[model samples]
Target: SLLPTAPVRIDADLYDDLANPARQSLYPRDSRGFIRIDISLRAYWHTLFDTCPRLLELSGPSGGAIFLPFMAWARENNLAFDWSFFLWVYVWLQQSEFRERLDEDQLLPVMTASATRWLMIDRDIDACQIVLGSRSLAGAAVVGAKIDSIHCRLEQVQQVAFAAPLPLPDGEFGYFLTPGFEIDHFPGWRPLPR
Candidate 1:
């Protein structure tokens, strides 16, 4: 996609209401580039340390490694974006990839439960007592996506609501966009697809 012409966002009201003290309330509506994200910094670090410390440590060197390409792309396109968020994304991806390398052993099962509990609080404002990490991950992604999508479909510009038609991926038109530079703002991010 050309990025604009029909922009998207994650959902302002929904995420803006994220009770998590670590989360930021807003997002850009036009940028489509990566930048070091500030919100959820603790979650990112905690995920590495608690979920898979070994893999995170092994990531090595903070040069032009993970988000440089996305950042460069943003600069080239004159897109108002951030690259900081990629660090956490890269870490999470690496943790998933090298799960076996850590030889977590007993830690694996325990972590599953721990991750679940953490996610429940971090995610759903009302999802009570999640018991498994995988379950929390799956549930959070699904419920969060649904809420985000609905919020985006109803954009409010200066308290004036309009059914703005915007073509999106899969010929769909709404908010809850996936995380990308397209929505330089928080809500513009497209819904995270499972």
Candidate 2:
């Protein structure tokens, strides 16, 4: 089963420190007042990562589609932390802090999810070196327009999507699987530089 095979528990206060909105100001910190918040977070993170046999099998060097189930549990339980936060620390930190502690195999999902969130939802630049490679967009106008609309500085990218370019074409407004499938862009349409 995908459910965690073992009980996962943490200090009640520590859970509050991590999940409570009132405590948000203390977020991204290792401690709050006298509590070492990271201690609990670290333990819980490891427990979830280590205990899941299915996660290991589903994960790869580039994908972590397996991590979502655990995330659902965390969310259902109102856990504040998510894979993106873990990766945010891994990438933003200068030295090997959490990175040294985590196995690269485990980080595959963290990086992939983090990249998707930042690039798609947050519309931020691609700074993480993991799970990203250069690709030309010359032949992919629809793809190019989406990336350009996000206004990322990265010249080359894996894949990032954004709103349809201006001058709407009837049914094409929000997100879609294939851009040209439903409605086509004007003959020579291109995204404006951001």
Candidate 3:
């Protein structure tokens, strides 16, 4: 017999924050507001690295792959914060400011979900890092594209098919499996001048 596990329930407000068009209008391309979002996730990454000290130091390839599930989750949730920037900085990049943005009440779950995603997919460390490191156009095009499409699909599918999409997958059951499989991207890469 299998033990029963309740599916993760997204708080309606959180869903609203992600999906409501009115809410979307509120979060428009304001740099300060977007910075708040970036800082918020960065705080979670900081705490995570504090607890699990070695995480930030992961090699570019290793750390890049590690970003897959969160990237996927962020895509699934419509939260396309700057992934490459976050991955590059890890804990040292940003600190308490992000946690400071959310009310104290919201902290625990945000951190937990962030940690859960990271730990669950650690086994796919190689694959995740691979996905991260490959500058090939194949993946770059959609590295930040997943969430918006997933949200659109959810709305249309719900109206037409009456189904909500599943959460993004972690690497454990095999690295590349995720809830939404159809993805498209316009790919290009530019090397930085140092």
Candidate 4:
């Protein structure tokens, strides 16, 4: 599911803490490396929001393709959290501190979902890395632009972990992805850096 298989039942205050604007880092910390996947998704969302509206009529963060069902549920419930917020919740759902709060039935799917997303995110990360390494402008352009546009700075990454976005708040982190203008700056690499 790439997210909680069931509604996360936390107290209003904890939910608010999660709903806070800035991210707090979380565990399986490297999972935040998938930020590029989301960047690509969110960027495409903007594209559809402008160039095509019909698909977005789905209320996408299909926008964030892997997030398709999760986004739908969010829309149905009128949950106001950003797409990435759910991403963090997915990550934290595995944390012992949080998982212990839920009983066995809740526990299994959380583990499965977390594990499954790890594989899937791992796949995308590897695939993007492959595309970047090959220096194929077709794919490289797609990836490099996301790296830059998301401000995935060498400095923004936390030393203790990845975006850990909703997982943790302090670190000497910086994003591992950096733009190789050789690809992004190419004259034909458009639809214009989106």
For every candidate, C-alpha RMSD to the true structure in Å: 18.9, 15.6, 19.5, 19.7
Query: Model 2: per-residue lDDT, tens digit, 71-186?
Result: 44444555334324444333322133233444544444443444344334443243222122111121222222225435667542244432554334232111222232133323
* Residue-level lDDT tens digits of model 3 in 1-194: 53222222323423434322223335435434433444554564554445444443442324433343444444554543422223322322223223233332232232233333443333542222111212211212121112234345431111011133322222111112222333232122232111
The global Cα lDDT (0 to 1) of model 3 is 0.31
Model 3 clash number? 4
C-alpha lDDT of all candidate models, in order: 0.30, 0.36, 0.31, 0.29
As for candidate 3, its clashing pairs are: 39-98, 65-128, 65-129, 75-147
| Shift in Å, residue 6, candidate 2 | 35
Model 1 per-residue lDDT tens digits across residues 39-153: 2334434443454443335454332232333234334444321212222233234444444444333334333323333333344444322221122122111112213233466
Show the lowest summed lDDT stretch of 10 residues, model 4.
130-139
Which residue pairs in candidate 2 collide? none
**RMSD score of candidate 2 (Å):** 15.6
The Cα RMSD of model 4 versus the native structure comes to 19.7
Choose the strongest candidate by TM-score: 1
Tell how far residue 64 is off in model 2, in angstroms: 20
Worst 10 residues of 3 by lDDT: 155-164
Each prediction's TM-score versus the true structure: 0.25, 0.23, 0.23, 0.19
